[model samples]
Target: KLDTRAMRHLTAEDWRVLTAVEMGSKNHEIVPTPLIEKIARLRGGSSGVHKSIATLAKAGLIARMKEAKYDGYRLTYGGLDYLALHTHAARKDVYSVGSRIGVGKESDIMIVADEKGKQKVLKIHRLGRISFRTVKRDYLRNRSTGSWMYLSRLAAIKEFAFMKALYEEGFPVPEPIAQSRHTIVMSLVDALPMRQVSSVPDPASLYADLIALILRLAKHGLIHGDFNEFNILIREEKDAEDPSSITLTPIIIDFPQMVSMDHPNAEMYFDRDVQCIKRFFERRFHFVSTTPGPFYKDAKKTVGKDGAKRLDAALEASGFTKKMAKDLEAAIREQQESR
Candidate 1:
């Protein structure tokens, strides 16, 4: 029931201020005069600045934090929730058929409901935290031959283009609901982040399914460079007694860091992604061989190895299993062959 008109009533500066506050800055904490000047320069006036602050305060989206000096202006929970909901609604109206579920670094996700009430995730890209230094670094790493100045630009555009192509290929990726500049709105998958909803009846089968999902992603010509348990979501079945495999699926997210087949760092990213998952299963579910030199060589060889082992054990009691590991291994191989 939210309207884009509400968004239009305020300028981009309003959104910026609201976002900054939502990130936990306090209101009335005098923004550095230089900082205000800089914002004025980019936004074209101090009036937009002042009005945005006042509007957000009136709307109860932000509060004057107690410290007022270090915190600047902090967004109240009310403000953050509104920002999440409204920003999503703004995009939904544009897509004409989707609902916004959540936002992530460099992008946001929407759930598009069809006539039948089935939904898909929509991913929308956005430009964030750009710095000239970052631009220079990006250029040095992935600079193309066609005079594109930096890595940041290439990375931004490439993410949108990659997802768009993936959407067209009929994979489980969220449909490309819409795109503009760095903004992308795509279908939202109804799943929980792997860390949140990893329980399954069969650990072995779940592992196999996850591995297959990764391989499937790779075959689609993109490597989820930022692939991590946090980015993967599991859809659980409604019936508690139902087999997990019968109802759950892994949904991938945070693709701005995705690399293409032609990317120089593609292989490295792929290795990291696979190793991460392998290590996760090894530590938590205790499903792998826990061998040496190569396959399941050392479960402790990955990130936070010692701590991960304990976490994995706790996870296993809830569900995860060895069969899932085998299934994942097979799926990964199959995906590799398809690629």
Candidate 2:
């Protein structure tokens, strides 16, 4: 039997019910017989098994599927969250006392703690094969009079400098606490990575917020050239009861590939960012953030009134559709070249 200390108030039936549901059972037909059989085999088919399943369902940990022929059950979001937290807490020492979070192609996020066990997050950009090629190519293309040999090294420094500048400009980004060659240590945004909690109750509203964030970044003469779902962390309030609060925020990470406002491909990169998010929302939640008319109007407002008119005309001439505007960039690139 698993230790139930973390779930002290939860009955054994609750765990069993949650396990069944999380394993993909429908709500109504919990199909408790197999689970009961397993439990019986383990503990000699105790008489209290059915009652335990009933208690778990009643506790709202799992819901029964009404339409299913047999009553099936599944874990509620709350139940899944509880399980993740418990699992992490139970295996706290499995990793190093303060090991880094994980490595990515561009950056390595780490986990650290103060003496009292208060934890924080850290991100270090290493000069490796993944980012090296992109950074070097962009550096060479930018007309910087630098040797190709040191371009990657220089790009790393440039990225670090950009992070520091953004930090000083009052942007709500990671605060740089330490720095060295090809490495940096900064505050982590929240308890979990942003990718894990990207689920938003309102996709449209969230998309609008994302646009506003990008616009703000544009105003700073810097663009998060690689802005995407994976790079944004959604932080929820620690208190379960209050889901909406100031603490509930999205923190953007991975700014190494940022572009200046004057970059030749600035608009292309910006549109790519916009379209990536638009497609994610549309495909996942069936929501569209902007129609062609509104997007044309806003693009013009950002660029200029007359410029907007010309851009809108060009868009129509180029067979631009509201739907196509939100397509994946790689696919769009393929389409553009096919012409």
Candidate 3:
């Protein structure tokens, strides 16, 4: 969704002006030209800043106002993407950007690689794109661009923290490599989302595996708020001894809405996760388990069972305060309802 064709064409001064718009945008909703020039004080001063701003505007990185009181610019989504990608490259977490493998209203998933050609996933959280979703329209009415940029960055930050906690807990998730702005660089999972997997030889086995994964998260004091076929990746591995029987391992992704076991709506999210897998299995494979409940009460009782780490609490302690969680949750909820 991001037209990165202009990335390589951007000059040094152009990038400075672009970043200046971002810095100026920190306080100003629509950054004023004076602030931009002040932030981007090159040798030639205003001329240098003005030229780059024009070039950046032409590249669709920054946008100039139409018949406004004073001249100003707002950083476009493409500008933020370039900022994030630039950071990733400078840190050597990403050397090259590749084909886009996934796209949602709230995110773009790109396959990238490191300097050593190691494959990784670049997740760009784009929450602001859900503009018409009626997101806190009163107070944030005119602050559209700022809200979108801030919300997207908040999402990336939250997701990276969750992935880091889950990874350290020995959970099967993409290895969190680096995060900057609204982007996350993580090890790519070599699997297809369960949505595209047409058939599985042992549907019951895979279904059980998914249920167990849900229970596993509960024990760790966390619940994947959006557990479903689309978020679970089915990795196929042929048995070494018998190639006839392949094993399907499920790798979960998407953590922007993950909830703490102690959250007020914890039971709702927990049951939804369980019910999601149940409905998917029955619909996809015409298979239903004879065993009844992986009920919320049972899962709640298992919280902290077997010395399992409280990942929810762990993430909270990592500077992800309740307010941060609340903001991201509200945005994600609006994201869900809008669709």
Candidate 4:
């Protein structure tokens, strides 16, 4: 769904023009040419803007849409990718985007590299499109086109904020590198999601570890709303003394839906997260723990205990607003229902 090849060749004026169209998309779904011309305000003249615009459109960075009564052009999916990639580039967080490593209903994960060719994972949020590469965007356009763009942007912001705190608090997650618009760059893990794991040496041990992870999140005043097989990356480490022996480590991911332990439906979400694991372990590993849930009731009581920082309440330091949290909740819940 994303091609970074065209990204390398764009000139400076082209980035300015592309960026202007992005700024133009803020108040207008379909940004107009006059605004693009005015905002970019390149050194040469209106003619220079057109030259870069022509260059941009030729590369499919921006698409001139219908109802040109005002001569409007909108940013395509490719356009947003360029903008986000450009930001990552400026921040020195990413150098070149490589092959897409993973794709999903809500996001696209790409393998990216920095200046040194150090690999990283780039997750590009693509909300509202069930079939990104094929189906028409009409389904997404049925609502405000800007809504999905803003919603996904919010998705990146929320996740980046949460993961930053989670990492600082010693959670086992992908180390967050940087986030821009609807995309995020994180340390790449050479592991597969638990969904693909056929078997493990000790399912019982990993099961308890996964359960403890959820309890720990609650201890810090949060809930990973979706803690299923797909969100857990199972990585292996060989024993130093014996190559045949390995240890399985579970790394949590995909925190766009994580909520505060104090959320109205906090218990339900916690239970769902707990139950999702229970069912997965039972069906896949054929091992079910007789231990009852560390239940949300018990989890709730442990919030902010033993000098644990209130990540849920303190995450506002990242400038993530409750309104944006609500925005993610509503949109993600809608998609959940849609699914």
Candidate 5:
């Protein structure tokens, strides 16, 4: 949806002006035009800066707003996306953007490639777009400073941090490569979501593996707040030695709402995750477990049982502030409720 054709046309001065607007955004909701001129002048003169501003605004990267006191410009979502992708390009993390593979209520998933032609996934977090319609009045009244760009960045950062921890632990998750602004680059998992799978060769085996994954996360002091068929990708691998044998591997994705097992409502989240799989299995595979619950109380007892690290602590340790986590949690909760 983002028309990146402007990327090739942007001059050096245009990029300077764009970066200046982004830098000024941290302090001002609508960055003062004078400040843009000041920052851009560091790279060039005032006249060239003005020209670049016009170019960026024409490209829809920056939007002009008239306040009661003064007129200023705000970096649009398009601008932020370009800045992020520009960083990725500079780092050689992503070279070309391909077709969008998926779109969610809060994010966009695109197939991208590096200079070496290796494919990767680019997840762009766009939080609050849907929730704003329902909670707009209250959101503005309570936290006018909570911009979509800020919340989306928090989502990307939180997700990237969790992906890194899980991948390092040998968990079946996409390997996180890089993060910039509200976007993250990760290794591509060649699989379809379990939601798209009509049937599995062995529903019981797949069901057992998914249940085991839920329990495994509990042991790491984590709860995947939204573990459903949509978030689980299934990869079918044929046996290398025995060509007749096949294995169904489930790779978990999406982690913005993951909560600590010690969270106040952890049990409810854990139960919901289990029930999601159960209901999906019954509906799609006509499989029902005769066994009893893998209840939260039992999972709680196993936390750190085998010396599993408390991954819930991973975010804070990765420089994510408590306030950031709180804000993101509130937004995610509001989004879920709206759905």
Candidate 6:
């Protein structure tokens, strides 16, 4: 968890120093002390900048690298977190941060509120925290020390891009609000993960809805690689006239692993998504369908049919390069294998 105790104590000068460190980080792995002072001086005097630096270092936001030949400091993960939160706060995307709602292999989900007390979801991606077991050892060995920070940012960018496209396409998903660094702010869905739903009144209806969602995604030229119960949220809505009658709505989340329908292993991913729903329904609800198959071959035929937009191309069109996609895919595959 992020320790935000220092936030309230930090003065305006300290924030300026922190921002300077972040700006220096863009070009230097370890930003030189001289550069920090120079940048910080734009907002404050030399003595004040030095004082803020001391305060920031004491708070673990920036760490002095003893191994470096020259005197310098590097922004810690804590520092990056602070900088991202500061940006969000400035833009009014988040006001107060609350408890952590979920923890995944590579991300943390936190509940944050806006100025009007409206709650939202904050997802922080922390890639490379887990060692890769399946990826080549040489490949891992050649990676830079800053690979974690870069990969985490890539994951956030990819996820946010896909979320925007899906939401715009009328998919039932959390509303994407803003993204900064390795974190993203989205609308909070007041619902439970399908994993936590022990029982439902109409399992068949819910099961059919999930299958239909999968097909709909296929039609849009995308595949949710991880379409398990944990990624599916089930929301309950009661009828206005009849409180006893409830409607179940499913909202999908988590899109860093989404793939194109034209991907090499698209069929494999499609089949897994289908089987996940089938197995979950049979196990949890004890409800099995008599229908034979929503086969990948059939789904493939529907891609881009009936004027459907090809959302798989959305990320690339939004400036997500092929190299970034490859790197994120490698990291995600490694994460899944390690799990």
lDDT of each: 0.49, 0.50, 0.85, 0.86, 0.88, 0.87
Which candidate do you rate higher for lDDT, 4 or 6? 6
Superposed by TM-score, candidate 5 places the C-alpha of residue 198 at a distance from the truth, in angstroms, of 3.6
lDDT (Cα) of model 4: 0.86
lDDT by residue for model 3 (82-156), tens = 999998988889999886667776788999988899899999887746334546811234347778788878888
User: Lowest-scoring 10 consecutive residues by lDDT in candidate 2?
Assistant: 304-313
lDDT assessment of candidate 3: 0.85
Report the number of backbone clashes for model 3: 0
The local lDDT score (0 to 100) that residue 218 gets in candidate 4 is 94
Which lDDT tens digits does candidate 5 get at residues 1-339? 566889989987788899999998887788889999988786346667888888999999998989997588988888989999999999999999996556677788889999999999999987765434446512223434327789989999999999999999989999999999899999999988999975577899999999999999999999999999999999988899996767899999999999999999999999999999999999999999987889999999999887798888889876788899898999899888877
Q: Please list all clashing residue pairs in model 6, or write none if there are none.
A: none
lDDT of 4 by residue, 5-77 (tens): 7887898889999999999888878888889998898664655888888888989989888784767788877
Lowest summed lDDT window (length 10), candidate 3: 134-143
**Local accuracy of candidate 2 as per-residue lDDT tens digits, 1-339:** 112233567655556545544444322224445553364343464546566556666665555554435544445433543443344434441122253357554345557554456555544443222223345512213222112212223333445566666666666667765443344445656545444654556666667777777766665555576777786766666556764633446667665566655456777777877887777777777898554422322442353222221111222333435443333223223323443
Please identify model 3 stretches exceeding 4 Å from their true place. Answer: 42-47, 66-70, 130-143
Candidate 2 residue runs with Cα over 4 Å from true position = 1-97, 114-118, 130-156, 191-194, 238-248, 291-339
lDDT of 6 at 156: 90
Q: Candidate 3: give the clashing pairs.
A: none
Clash count, one per candidate: 36, 19, 0, 0, 0, 0
In model 4, how large is the Cα lDDT of residue 282? Answer: 86
Model 3 TM-score? 0.92
Better of 1 and 6 by TM-score: 6
TM-score of each: 0.47, 0.49, 0.92, 0.93, 0.93, 0.91
